[PDB]
Design a protein around this ligand. Structure first.
Ligand SMILES: Nc1ccn([C@@H]2O[C@H](CO)[C@@H](O)[C@H]2O)c(=O)n1
Ligand SMILES: Nc1ccn([C@@H]2O[C@H](CO)[C@@H](O)[C@H]2O)c(=O)n1
Ligand SMILES: Nc1ccn([C@@H]2O[C@H](CO)[C@@H](O)[C@H]2O)c(=O)n1
Ligand SMILES: Oc1ccc(-n2ccnc2)cc1
Ligand SMILES: [Cl-]
Ligand SMILES: [K+]
Ligand SMILES: [Zn+2]
Ligand SMILES: [Zn+2]
Ligand SMILES: [Zn+2]
Lengths: 153, 158, 151
């Protein structure tokens, strides 16, 4: 029936004396992500993908003072539903030279799935290095990409 | 039903002495995007996403720069011809989403007009077209304001 | 019915001493992609989009094999999870060499490996307008999107 797709992008700088929080998971590391919120690059990209699929604009059009990125993802889900859409699936990729994200991925999926009220099998998170190329390759920031499918019920 | 997705990417350098044209909107700015056409990075990304969804190749296959008419070509006219070819191949467009990444200028006040242009060229209602804007958080050539990037996604149905 | 989308990304450094293999096609060139196996940046991105659509994690969690064998095993896993592939679209970003003449060859390799009609597979090419490590010819990037349906 009335399916729509959305895509999302984010990047934040890695800076000293900040926690690294990705997909709502705190990952031990000497740097963390810089942003007005908690700088959760993965959650921001997915949020942008969901708004894009519902044609609701973007994260900066909607947004909460001191709200963490999970609260913002939950509010995104609310606004998507308000517009008449159900979320069908989310897929994503984190690009980080370091640290190793592998043992944290299923926790990020579980977080996203709880926040969006989706079963686990409709949420995916992937990881890639940047083969030491560019600012990502030098560990100067972390990027996330996201894709979402929604349907107007 | 026979749904298909497409994705697109574009980037152009930002240089003095060119109009800044994104999503068909001329934006007051002291630099513009460099290309053989009007260099409309957002429209090119969306055009690639539509050709891609329809499995019709890419924008360079359809609109060759070896043609003089490509010089300063209106990227909305290219987008409309793309949509016509996608329709001719048997596909209806269901939605478009996109992202522009630019350090500057401020895009927010032009976004709704970009969306209106795309919706007009694709013969869609506004509510099936979306345009998002991002900085690159000061990282890389984008953070240095050397170019502007666009990303796009499209869903069509045969 | 029960459609799902996936997206994929990959990048490899481009250097002398290795052949250039993209979309299973060997392309004549002074340099080639550095990676564990054949460094096939396009097949890797597409494999990731397929696993992503099926919510099966990623290429590194699943896997001498060449990237086409990996793509085939990926399709089989996607199939076993209950999904049929509807279509694939992709973009290679390479400042050089010229990729247009090899596009049908890549599409044909990908289509064969996924058991898809040729008209459900698309590959596009872009330069990076001389910006960044891609624009300087230091690497090649690929991006992929896949649509599947749970049958
Ligand atoms: N060059 C740019 C980049 C971003 N933006 C707007 O700022 C908010 C934060 O990304 C987003 O809402 C975005 O639309 C902008 O107006 N111009
Ligand atoms: N490495 C590349 C890059 C680009 N191209 C083709 O040239 C057009 C404009 O860059 C693109 O749209 C594409 O058709 C190519 O054949 N190989
Ligand atoms: N910073 C990173 C980057 C990637 N990965 C994991 O490594 C494997 C190959 O990319 C993939 O399986 C991916 O999930 C990781 O654990 N941490
Ligand atoms: O024939 C061409 C050449 C370049 C094109 N392009 C480069 C960047 N954006 C569009 C498109 C079509
Ligand atoms: Cl920036
Ligand atoms: K990028
Ligand atoms: Zn962010
Ligand atoms: Zn362009
Ligand atoms: Zn790879």
């Amino acid at each position: 029936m009335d399916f729509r797709i959305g895509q999302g992008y984010d990047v934040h700088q890695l800076v000293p004396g900040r926690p690294l929080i990705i997909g709502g998971v705190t990952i031990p590391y000497e740097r963390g992500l810089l942003g007005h919120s908690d700088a959760d690059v993965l959650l921001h990209a997915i949020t942008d993908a969901l708004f894009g699929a519902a044609a609701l604009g973007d994260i900066g059009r909607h947004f909460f003072k001191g709200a963490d990125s999970r609260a913002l993802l939950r509010e995104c889900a609310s606004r998507v539903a308000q517009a008449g859409f159900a979320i069908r699936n989310v897929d994503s990729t984190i690009i980080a030279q370091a640290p190793k994200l592998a043992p944290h991925i299923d926790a990020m999926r579980a977080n996203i799935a709880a926040d969006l009220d989706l079963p686990l099998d409709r949420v995916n998170v992937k990881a890639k290095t940047n083969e030491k190329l560019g600012y990502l390759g030098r560990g100067e920031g972390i990027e996330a990409q996201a894709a979402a499918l929604v349907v107007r019920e």
